[model samples]
Target: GAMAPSYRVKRMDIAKNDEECVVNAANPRGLPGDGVCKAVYKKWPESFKNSATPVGTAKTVMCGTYPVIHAVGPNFSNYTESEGDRELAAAYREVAKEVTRLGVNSVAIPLLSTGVYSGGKDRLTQSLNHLFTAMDSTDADVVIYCRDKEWEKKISEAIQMRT
Candidate 1:
């Protein structure tokens, strides 16, 4: 009704924010390693507590600075190939719901299913589109945080195509 939260592509570090909640994918073990996970873990090791069932649901940890949404999706070793999109969509939806429930006005989300999860660059655009679509019901402003200029361009292009 209110035009699902406005979305934007930003080429910046998600950790730099002290206001918005940050979203990162976590393994079923709730372990944080390489990529965004590692960055988040280094900043707030106490946030991750226990393992989640693989592709089960999203969990939020309230770090003193800001909340982090640990959205369980695909992992590196035993990743679900065909179900990647579904897993990512579910994770996005969970993050959206969590942000809304927390009354947070904004949240920064990484491009899930990409990076070492090895979803590959080819799947980045599709995964991002699916995430935006999944958050269509959220009222929180969504920022698709990109790793670099190239990724920012790709995400921006995908958003443009959707509009």
Candidate 2:
């Protein structure tokens, strides 16, 4: 039987995906020099730090053999709850568009706004639901990478409702 062209929720470490390109929620100032972007910066610092990309945009960075989609997401300093959510959705869509343009079969993405800039658990969940809805129409095989099992379950449930 053929598989459906829909998003899949996976409880896995995003850093372990060596074969496929991963999406990184970068700050407007450029790729954040800490947290998730820290590892990516360590891999390729100059390119990430020197970029003048604005927020709510996506840029592809070559990380060894994999391409990292560095999406300039909203931070806690600049956006309100709903504003952040909207920007997060825009960033997700940008990444999906980039994935399709690159012709990549798979792309892994994380919950964009729930880290240091977390709006709230409820807000995060709502933003994720919106993101999955936006991503459902993408051509690439999208993978929602979750760091925690609880989040994985939640994302899986949300995806199930959408698909």
Candidate 3:
């Protein structure tokens, strides 16, 4: 399953029709395992813009903890049959790289491409695989945090199979 072409670069449009990437500092003080992400509003930070918007389309907003950052496609609604799972993996890889760059050696991640956006065991597992591959220098510990026991079991099974 590890193919050279699988790691090829791909283009993605992150902003919604009227939104853009904006960076807001999230409180690093939150208790571990806590779901609360307190965002400190800052002027649209420089690290938030993307030049890859559609040719003439204008970006209207910036990044924030409101939308948060994840390594996967936009809400599952945006994923279509034609787009497929490979794109999802690419998104996960990018997200993992960004998170790691933030100096988080160990962090928990939700089933990124799953949830309401894109729920599928295969896709989720593939995305995780891509993310693990991107962490080159260190073994970035990723805890697959799920919302419930059933989900936890499913995610665990997926990981076990992948390994």
Candidate 4:
């Protein structure tokens, strides 16, 4: 019973999530750019300079109503495919560890290794698979945010593995 949890991928806006913490698809340096990173960065005014969190790990920033767990995912610009997968896996594992560390009931996570990071449908599927497998080790409710309608549809198909 040390494995599996109530994890689900839903079509929703993570910004409106009521979870105790929300996971940001952060870059390794923690700099804010396009995508979810930009949205999270714009939430507050006096923002951070840079992130101390290494690649494949997370950092918690107390901002607004909930604790924001900026999870730095892998990038093809730095890692080979195999190595990037490992980083993606580690980042998801660290998400579980973060939940445990904070004792939070739930957290919303976005796609971390896709978009400009991968530029491939294979990585999208791979990222979701890693997320499901990694979070299988945690008991906290894992609510995945598929912000894009098209991506949400993809997630629904990908979730077939759940059954």
Candidate 5:
């Protein structure tokens, strides 16, 4: 199926020093203080959002001079037939668009609606593919860094198995 949308998928190992590692074993929290989100914040103090409230599914904060978007909650595949999937898709899409709006050409994303959410590969890929396809090439590059095999297997296979 179009090579599993490889053009839209990029994989990288999670940073060992990311904040999420401190709280969760897998650094799977949807909050800004976890995983690469924290390191990104420390790397780029200027992008840090100290506000009490942030919007969206995961969390939002400037990560290392880049607009880092985090996705928390369940996987999209778990409820592909439900309205929740639609909501999840829309939410992720909005996040991607907003990240692009910030004048960045590259975005590092976690598996939104897939981790704790438990979204299936097909459904989750579709969700991400849709978001990436809709984005303007000039806005930013969408880079999904994941530690899970699902992401690595699927994305790498989809990307011509370059690895």
Candidate 6:
């Protein structure tokens, strides 16, 4: 790839990537079940107002800390690996579409369906590539947020090896 990239990794903490919009990996119901949805909703409850979203769909909501585009990712516990990956990829694309529509050049996203949803540790890097493909289609600056030190290490190692 001649062009460097519009993607990078960051800590999962909301305070890290100061972007115009943050993409939250929420459950299909868009409720604050766990992971990003839980943390985000806890910090800004208003983000949950209009949150009935479907898997593979993204929706924007006005909020205090920063504007958010809630991306509903699949619950891996429910689908086969292929099915789940497809859902996650579509979810990221939906997020990319939202940010593109809003014309926000800055967006932060995290590994969707992780934690209790179980996107699988092996699928993390594949998901990263899927996310980059989505971001590459957009004109926005995107950051991939890692949930913890373990994930941060995994993600960083993934990126470094590709270099």
* Candidate 3, residue 62: lDDT: 25
TM-score, every prediction = 0.85, 0.81, 0.45, 0.84, 0.54, 0.85
Off by over 4 Å in 1: 1-4, 51-53, 119-121
* True-vs-predicted CA distance for residue 120, candidate 1, Å: 4.2
Compared with the true structure, what per-residue lDDT tens digits does model 6 show for residues 19-136?
7778877776767876677878876678888788888888888786467888887778888889888988999888877888887767778877776767445567767777877777
Q: If candidate 4 were superposed on the true structure by all CA atoms, what would the RMSD be?
A: 3.1
What digit string (tens of lDDT, one per residue) describes model 5 on residues 44-155? Answer: 4454344222223434555554444444333344444466556555556556555545654444555444444444344557555545544433345445566666667776
- Total clashing pairs in model 4: 0
RMSD to the hidden true structure, all candidates: 2.7, 3.0, 12.2, 3.1, 7.5, 3.2
What stretches of model 3 exceed 4 Å from their correct place?
A: 1-72, 119-138, 161-163
Model 2 regions more than 4 Å off:
1-3, 43-49, 120-122
Residue pairs of candidate 3 with colliding backbone atoms: 21-63, 22-62, 22-63, 76-117
Candidate 3, 65-128: lDDT as tens digits: 3233423243345546446455555555554455545543443344444544454334555545
Candidate lDDT scores, in order, read: 0.73, 0.69, 0.37, 0.75, 0.45, 0.76
Question: Which structure among the candidates has the greatest lDDT?
Answer: 6
Per-residue lDDT of 44-127 in model 4, one digit per residue for the tens? 322344555788998777665467887888877768888988989899888877777887778788878786777454576788
Give a tens-digit lDDT track for model 1, residues 32-124: 777787887887777886634457378888777578888876643465665665676777777777888778778878877777775444567
Query: Candidate 3 — worst ten consecutive residues by lDDT sum?
Result: 1-10
Evaluation by lDDT, superior candidate among 5 and 6? 6
- Select the stronger candidate by lDDT from 1 and 2: 1
lDDT of 1 at 52: 48
Better of 2 and 3 by lDDT: 2
